Amino acid sequence: MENWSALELLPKVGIPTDFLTHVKTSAGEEMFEALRIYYGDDPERYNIH
Amino acid sequence: RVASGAGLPTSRQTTIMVTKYSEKSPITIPFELSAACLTYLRETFEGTILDKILNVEAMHTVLRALKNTADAMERGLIHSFLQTLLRKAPPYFVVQTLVENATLARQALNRIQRSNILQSFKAKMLATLFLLNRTRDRDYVLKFLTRLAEAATDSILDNPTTYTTSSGAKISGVMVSTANVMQIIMSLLSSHITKETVSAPATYGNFVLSPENAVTAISYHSILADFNSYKAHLTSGQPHLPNDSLSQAGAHSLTPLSMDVIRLGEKTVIMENLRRVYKNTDTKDPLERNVDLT
Amino acid sequence: TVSAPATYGNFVLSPENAVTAISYHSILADFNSYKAHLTSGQPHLPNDS
Amino acid sequence: MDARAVAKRPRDPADEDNELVTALKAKREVNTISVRYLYHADHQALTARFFVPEGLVEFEAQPGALLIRMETGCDSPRHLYISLYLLGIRASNVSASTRCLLESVYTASAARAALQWLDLGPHLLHRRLETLGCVKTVSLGITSLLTCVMRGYLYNTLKTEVFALMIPKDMYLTWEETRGRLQYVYLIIVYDYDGPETRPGIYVLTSSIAHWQTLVDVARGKFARERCSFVNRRITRPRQIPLCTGVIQKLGWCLADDIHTSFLVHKELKLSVVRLDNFSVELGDFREFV
């Protein structure tokens, strides 16, 4: 399974994103093959092992 | 997010992670050589002039086969790319319904919202099934093409120096169709068609594994492209990367070549027909299709 | 009277170790020695990590 | 002819440059196609390509399946290509639980058609079958493509991996306590002549014996009951003219140390098999014995 914490830590490229519809609508209507959504602040990325 | 007033539920901050995968589509084609060709290719019986003629014939046979197969490989690459693009491209009524209902929902669709979506689907499917047969008004087709261009979303990578003209205002898309349709459009909208020279990359870009990538491929069966840049930015504390691994793999040299473009509301796109590729081949042009109505 | 080490030993991660730890959850100690020996084509490392 | 010509040892097939490179060098012309090394140029195994409908391809996705050609008694498909696993359904040798398992696996129209065609006619089973070899590839689709070797070892493009031959455990048969170093493997079909209809037994035998007469004597020792049944039917039921009590076909040779036990997984169901690690195919015809 995809490890989202690695994406969360590693440097990223700044992009102007363009979803035609609302992001939560495209995600809820299952546009993307794999998806992770969390609210607030998730401590998962901090426990490097 | 936007701050809310008294008595309303506040919107919590949220982050979204998505990932996209690649798909593979190999192509192939055979060519054949006869044993008679092979024996005379590498044999000299007494060296008489007839034997020299036969040697020359075998050499030319294999050379013709190689050239024909290389041309076939180029054509097959074009064919495969076009098939992939057609596979991912939805029809006009879907995309126009989406663009007209973009602000409708900020969540998964209700019953009512998707009922409205379905109504729009049906109406637009009936209204625009055969565009050029039911109308040839100049303004209407111009607006329709403009809508087709506007509906598509932007790409996440953009090399600003490639596919540009001497008029250097940049090109944004390509519109492809059969020769007859392109002829009809060009004659109908000639006030917007122009002939241009475009700078395009002269060769494929090169992507190379680094030795760190080799070590990680051996040990963990995975590579992270541009490993050293990631490590340098991570250790220095900079959160953002200036470029993308695939983008920096792009070719440097670019060549000029001639093609036709159309203006679609401060947006210029290229027009092409692929009649050349399928001129005398066995494969059918994938832009010529059948449609069923019941 | 015998001679004994005066101080503890120190083991420290390389930056590439940090990258592989974050991405793959794994460390190959003395990563650059492996890289250089593998590329140069010589089979034996001088000593372990 | 001269002394230097006789003394000259033959050219190495690997140090001469191939025909395409020869032509390109002769004209000094470049080509996009990579040409310096030709793949499969040194495969000594002989292979063939077979098309098979989607329903029949199950447990043959993994390499190492034995491939049989069956006659339909019809002109529209004429022949079908089936595996030993499918014959596992019809064989009386296979146990009830395994029969149920691999009957649940082959729940497709094509497989059921194969079974109906097999049971429909009045001929014995072996007259309807022709053995092709072992398979090592798959390209899936509505019509799948299988490549099968009919003389040689089983291996991929670079010989970086050698494939085994998979036999279902109920069909595996041995008749010696300590194995000879070199083992020959045979396919056996034996008929039991009970009252209503013949029930066929299907086996794959691994043996050290290469001589036909000694092997058939051992087989007649092992299958005495079926021979008794054959004679009993000949006595009780005239105007039924049976032939044969069994047939034996040779296909392959392997070393005794290569023999192992293993399982196969398909749609999270486990089938247990015997595994011949470095098996090389060498097909014979059906020889019949009484």
Side-chain angles (χ1 to χ4, degrees):
Chain A
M1 186 47 70
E2 230 61 65
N3 61 333
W4 308 108
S5 35
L7 161 70
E8 209 157 17
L9 286 173
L10 288 183
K12 283 170 283 294
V13 172
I15 292 304
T17 61
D18 187 22
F19 315 90
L20 175 61
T21 189
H22 188 278
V23 197
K24 289 183 177 175
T25 308
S26 72
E29 292 300 319
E30 216 174 329
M31 184 155 214
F32 301 115
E33 302 98 305
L35 171 75
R36 173 89 198 294
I37 299 184
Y38 79 78
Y39 297 89
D41 185 32
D42 185 7
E44 191 214 299
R45 69 193 177 281
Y46 285 105
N47 80 316
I48 297 173
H49 66 275
Chain B
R1 54 195 184 120
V2 52
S4 58
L8 304 186
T10 56
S11 53
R12 293 178 73 200
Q13 62 203 129
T14 174
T15 85
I16 301 162
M17 322 271 197
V18 306
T19 177
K20 300 193 60 137
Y21 301 88
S22 53
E23 301 176 39
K24 54 174 62 70
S25 53
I27 58 172
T28 183
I29 201 168
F31 69 89
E32 292 159 46
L33 271 64
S34 64
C37 172
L38 290 177
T39 175
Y40 281 101
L41 181 63
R42 52 192 169 212
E43 194 52 74
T44 58
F45 315 84
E46 189 172 29
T48 81
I49 66 182
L50 287 172
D51 306 287
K52 284 173 165 57
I53 287 159
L54 289 175
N55 299 142
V56 169
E57 186 55 39
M59 191 213 302
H60 287 318
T61 301
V62 55
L63 291 157
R64 287 190 300 257
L66 285 170
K67 283 192 175 70
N68 182 270
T69 306
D71 190 62
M73 212 60 49
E74 291 287 330
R75 296 178 190 253
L77 178 58
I78 291 167
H79 184 72
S80 181
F81 185 60
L82 177 52
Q83 285 197 325
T84 302
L85 256 51
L86 285 172
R87 171 157 46 251
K88 61 173 41 55
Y92 167 82
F93 60 87
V94 170
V95 295
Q96 186 62 26
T97 289
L98 289 175
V99 74
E100 281 175 19
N101 295 273
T103 70
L104 178 62
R106 65 207 82 88
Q107 197 171 111
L109 299 179
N110 297 344
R111 306 173 59 82
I112 308 310
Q113 288 170 345
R114 76 175 179 256
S115 80
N116 298 333
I117 296 299
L118 172 57
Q119 175 183 245
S120 193
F121 278 177
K122 283 152 44 71
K124 282 174 170 56
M125 187 269 287
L126 285 188
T128 63
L129 188 59
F130 304 126
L131 180 80
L132 293 181
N133 292 73
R134 60 172 62 209
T135 181
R136 218 151 286 173
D137 178 45
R138 182 169 288 122
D139 286 354
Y140 182 80
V141 304
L142 182 68
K143 300 305 179 69
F144 185 89
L145 297 185
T146 303
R147 285 183 190 124
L148 282 176
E150 284 301 321
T153 63
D154 288 342
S155 180
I156 68 154
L157 70 85
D158 175 27
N159 187 354
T161 194
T162 198
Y163 284 101
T164 187
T165 173
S166 311
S167 209
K170 301 198 300 290
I171 290 171
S172 70
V174 59
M175 199 169 286
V176 64
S177 193
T178 191
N180 180 243
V181 168
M182 297 307 317
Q183 177 175 21
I184 292 165
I185 292 171
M186 286 164 173
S187 59
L188 183 56
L189 298 185
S190 61
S191 54
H192 292 74
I193 312 314
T194 48
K195 178 78 73 177
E196 290 289 343
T197 53
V198 180
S199 301
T203 186
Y204 299 106
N206 198 48
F207 180 86
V208 179
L209 260 69
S210 81
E212 303 80 11
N213 293 336
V215 177
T216 64
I218 290 163
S219 60
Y220 312 132
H221 304 293
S222 302
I223 72 170
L224 173 68
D226 207 10
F227 186 101
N228 282 313
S229 188
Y230 272 89
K231 106 185 180 194
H233 276 267
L234 185 64
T235 196
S236 60
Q238 298 190 262
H240 294 121
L241 294 172
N243 218 11
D244 166 40
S245 47
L246 288 177
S247 71
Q248 67 202 35
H252 309 293
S253 184
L254 77 180
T255 189
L257 80 185
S258 174
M259 43 185 57
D260 312 342
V261 313
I262 180 174
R263 302 188 308 272
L264 288 177
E266 72 268 345
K267 182 188 300 289
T268 70
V269 315
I270 293 157
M271 295 181 293
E272 178 160 35
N273 59 295
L274 294 170
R275 185 66 188 132
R276 308 185 311 285
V277 189
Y278 308 104
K279 187 57 156 64
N280 290 307
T281 57
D282 291 335
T283 53
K284 189 168 176 168
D285 183 350
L287 289 166
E288 292 178 314
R289 306 295 294 212
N290 305 305
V291 165
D292 279 351
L293 297 175
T294 305
Chain C
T1 166
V2 309
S3 185
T7 312
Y8 287 81
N10 200 58
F11 179 95
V12 66
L13 270 71
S14 208
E16 34 274 41
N17 287 129
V19 175
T20 66
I22 289 175
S23 312
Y24 311 121
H25 305 286
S26 56
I27 287 308
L28 179 61
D30 205 23
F31 183 96
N32 304 70
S33 299
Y34 284 87
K35 191 185 80 180
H37 281 243
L38 190 69
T39 308
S40 54
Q42 56 203 17
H44 294 301
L45 296 169
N47 60 354
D48 65 282
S49 197
Chain D
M1 185 57 84
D2 61 70
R4 295 179 70 241
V6 174
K8 174 174 287 291
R9 305 295 86 200
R11 307 161 306 294
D12 190 334
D15 73 354
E16 295 288 342
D17 45 4
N18 64 64
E19 49 271 14
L20 316 182
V21 174
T22 291
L24 291 174
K25 180 175 288 178
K27 293 302 304 297
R28 298 99 62 75
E29 283 179 47
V30 295
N31 198 29
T32 306
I33 298 170
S34 187
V35 72
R36 189 173 63 254
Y37 176 81
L38 264 54
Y39 287 74
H40 297 4
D42 65 347
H43 290 3
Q44 304 183 25
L46 304 184
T47 77
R49 294 148 67 102
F50 294 92
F51 292 107
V52 55
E54 172 80 323
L56 279 171
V57 181
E58 268 144 346
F59 285 115
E60 312 89 1
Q62 289 102 328
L66 214 177
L67 197 72
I68 318 293
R69 187 193 81 172
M70 67 156 287
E71 295 226 312
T72 62
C74 187
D75 292 276
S76 45
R78 186 84 71 203
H79 291 100
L80 282 180
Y81 311 119
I82 68 172
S83 195
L84 184 69
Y85 314 121
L86 190 74
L87 292 184
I89 307 283
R90 193 151 291 284
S92 64
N93 177 39
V94 179
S95 79
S97 65
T98 43
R99 193 196 313 290
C100 175
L101 157 64
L102 92 173
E103 190 174 51
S104 80
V105 168
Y106 291 105
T107 44
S109 182
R112 303 208 202 188
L115 297 173
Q116 302 325 298
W117 277 314
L118 279 170
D119 63 51
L120 187 57
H123 283 177
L124 270 60
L125 175 63
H126 78 277
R127 291 176 63 82
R128 316 193 202 198
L129 300 181
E130 183 72 77
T131 307
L132 302 172
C134 288
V135 73
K136 48 121 190 168
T137 35
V138 71
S139 56
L140 292 170
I142 178 65
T143 58
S144 289
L145 167 64
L146 303 179
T147 75
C148 162
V149 310
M150 321 155 68
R151 197 168 180 79
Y153 295 90
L154 285 293
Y155 48 71
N156 71 97
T157 173
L158 279 162
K159 310 196 193 175
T160 197
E161 172 171 29
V162 181
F163 304 121
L165 162 67
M166 308 296 191
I167 305 158
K169 203 171 67 70
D170 293 333
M171 292 185 167
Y172 183 68
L173 198 65
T174 52
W175 294 335
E176 56 198 50
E177 292 190 333
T178 180
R179 303 180 194 263
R181 187 180 168 203
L182 169 65
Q183 296 285 310
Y184 301 97
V185 302
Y186 302 90
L187 181 78
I188 323 292
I189 306 176
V190 63
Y191 307 103
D192 193 357
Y193 290 99
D194 297 336
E197 61 272 337
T198 61
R199 295 293 290 124
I202 302 179
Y203 305 89
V204 185
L205 162 69
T206 309
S207 178
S208 298
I209 301 167
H211 189 71
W212 166 248
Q213 281 90 330
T214 45
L215 175 64
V216 74
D217 286 338
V218 182
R220 281 190 282 220
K222 289 285 188 284
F223 294 113
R225 187 186 66 87
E226 290 73 7
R227 301 173 81 222
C228 289
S229 86
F230 172 88
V231 185
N232 187 293
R233 190 192 213 79
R234 190 71 204 117
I235 288 162
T236 56
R237 294 264 287 281
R239 303 195 299 277
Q240 303 302 120
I241 314 299
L243 76 168
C244 300
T245 187
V247 291
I248 299 186
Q249 171 173 57
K250 186 196 74 176
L251 60 83
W253 71 257
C254 71
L255 309 178
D257 300 291
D258 301 328
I259 300 172
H260 296 291
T261 304
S262 276
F263 63 92
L264 289 180
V265 193
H266 194 280
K267 290 184 295 195
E268 61 260 12
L269 306 180
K270 279 176 60 177
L271 180 71
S272 66
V273 296
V274 175
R275 181 194 234 279
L276 277 47
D277 265 352
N278 295 284
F279 172 75
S280 65
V281 309
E282 177 152 30
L283 271 284
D285 47 344
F286 275 120
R287 292 182 74 160
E288 59 273 307
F289 71 94
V290 185

